[PDB]
Design a binder for this molecule. Structure first.
Ligand SMILES: O=C(CN1CCCC1)Nc1ccc(F)cc1
Ligand SMILES: [Zn+2]
Ligand SMILES: [Zn+2]
Ligand SMILES: [Zn+2]
Length: 459
């Protein structure tokens, strides 16, 4: 069972206010036909417009909440709302656009989806809380058929143009008017009691109902994200490379080793309490310190309470030595800590909007992260950039401009002049550090941390 069978039953109860008299007995096969689409017994890669929850989770980067609200259905104008925040008004003659005929509305839809998704996914998945009008309005902007490739490249086709009779992906669809072979999923098929707002508001106070189609579109995708990534966590699902994933992950490992190695050298803690990933390895394997591990999986709902991670009866005394929370999201870090905390507000192709202020960070695996909270860091300070190295000054083996920097903590800089080797390594480390900060990661440290204490490791 790779795809959702068209002969699967579709509960039509959510649809009978917009569509009175709808048959209770309904399949996807009959529903698609009623939506004005003909699938012609086609075995060409598009078995069903609707997909399973599992296929939706694999394609989370494609999710776009979609809601249609009748302003007045043949004679009435429709308000089309998308989880991008956009509201279009289609006439059959927070961004609010005035009423316009479908032929121009469909051009705006292709532009919006292509700009939102070209750097995220090879498709669109319309996330619905279906009541009727969203499904009946799809014939006005969607064309279906066999799976196709782009006219300008090797990617799959997501748009079609009636002006040129051609197909295009999200990158080459300027001037295209039809969404081609989109996917969709109705959240209302998952067995919920009550309406959209009552189920959304049980888990999220960040999205409100300003009573427009885009507000519902946002709540719909938010509730779908809560169900599939907050209260259900699957870290087995792999996701494609769409940006700087490999460099960001490599930078993270270099910054962790650098920052922990320097903290151990500058303050000589007898013990390190490593709280986080149960699969973690010693990031500074040559350090003299007693390394003690504590398992805690990445929290996807609310941040861990420090009182529950530490208390209720390990050295038992976490106040001895230093605590390392590398992506272990707690409500208030202890004063003796080294912390790496993902900033959920960061704008990037890897970070998708999430539930209750949190975000869905997708890098190889999907990780819903609780909202960034500045108050979690009151006992700590921001960790300044610095590069430390006790490696011998020796070139071995990229042209050179002399490096002058107060943050290159090396024997050569102490002795007056930075050597070529440490200058190349400094600039490579600064690049890795900047990559990690820009990816949304933030670094925090105990208030006594001072890089001045690293110069005396050169005696
Ligand atoms: O079933 C009907 C027609 N209704 C019920 C009987 C007479 C009026 N339409 C329809 C159903 C689902 C859908 F997605 C689009 C259209
Ligand atoms: Zn293309
Ligand atoms: Zn929400
Ligand atoms: Zn040097």
């Amino acid at each position: 069972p790779t795809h959702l069978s068209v002969d699967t039953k579709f509960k039509t109860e959510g649809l009978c206010v917009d569509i009175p008299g709808i048959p209770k007995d309904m399949t996807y096969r009959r529903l698609i036909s009623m939506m004005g689409f003909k699938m012609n017994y086609q075995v060409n890669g598009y078995p069903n417009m609707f997909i399973t929850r599992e296929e939706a989770i694999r394609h989370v980067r494609a999710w776009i909440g979609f809601d249609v609200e009748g302003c007045h259905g043949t004679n009435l104008p429709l308000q089309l709302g998308f989880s991008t925040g956009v509201n279009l008004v289609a006439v059959p003659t927070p961004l609010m656009y005035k009423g316009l005929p479908w032929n121009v509305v469909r051009i705006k839809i292709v532009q919006m989806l292509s700009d939102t998704l070209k750097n995220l996914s090879d498709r669109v998945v319309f996330v619905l809380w279906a009541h009727g009008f969203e499904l009946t309005s799809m014939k006005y902007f969607v064309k279906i058929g066999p799976e196709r490739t782009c006219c300008l490249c090797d990617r799959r086709a997501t748009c079609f143009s009636t002006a040129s009779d051609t197909y295009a992906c999200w990158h080459h669809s300027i001037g295209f008017d039809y969404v081609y072979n989109p996917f969709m999923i109705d959240v209302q098929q998952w067995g919920f009691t009550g309406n959209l707002q009552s189920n959304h508001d049980l888990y999220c106070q960040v999205h409100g109902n300003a009573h427009v189609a885009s507000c519902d579109a946002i709540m719909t995708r938010c509730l779908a994200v809560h169900e599939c990534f907050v209260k259900r966590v699957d870290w087995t699902i792999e996701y494609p490379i769409i940006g700087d994933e490999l460099k960001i992950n490599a930078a993270c490992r270099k910054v962790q080793h650098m920052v922990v190695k320097a903290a151990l050298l500058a303050d000589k803690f007898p013990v390190l309490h490593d709280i986080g990933n149960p699969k973690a390895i010693k990031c500074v394997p040559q350090a003299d310190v007693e390394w003690k591990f504590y398992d805690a999986q990445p929290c996807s709902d609310k941040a861990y309470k420090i009182e529950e991670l530490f208390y209720s009866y390990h050295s038992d005394k976490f106040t001895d030595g230093v605590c390392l929370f590398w992506n272990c999201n707690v409500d208030r870090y202890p004063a003796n800590s080294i912390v790496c905390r993902f900033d959920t507000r960061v704008l990037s192709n890897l970070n998708l909007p999430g539930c209750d202020g949190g975000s869905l960070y997708v890098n190889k695996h999907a990780f819903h992260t609780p909202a960034f909270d500045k108050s979690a860091f009151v006992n700590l300070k921001q960790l300044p950039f610095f590069y430390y190295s006790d490696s011998p000054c020796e070139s071995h083996g990229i042209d050179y401009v002399p490096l002058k920097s107060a943050t290159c903590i090396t024997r050569c800089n102490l002795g007056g002049a930075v050597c070529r080797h440490h200058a190349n390594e400094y600039r490579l480390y600064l690049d890795a550090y900047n990559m990690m900060i820009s990816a949304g990661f933030s670094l925090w440290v105990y208030k006594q941390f001072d890089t001045y204490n690293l110069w005396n490791t050169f005696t």
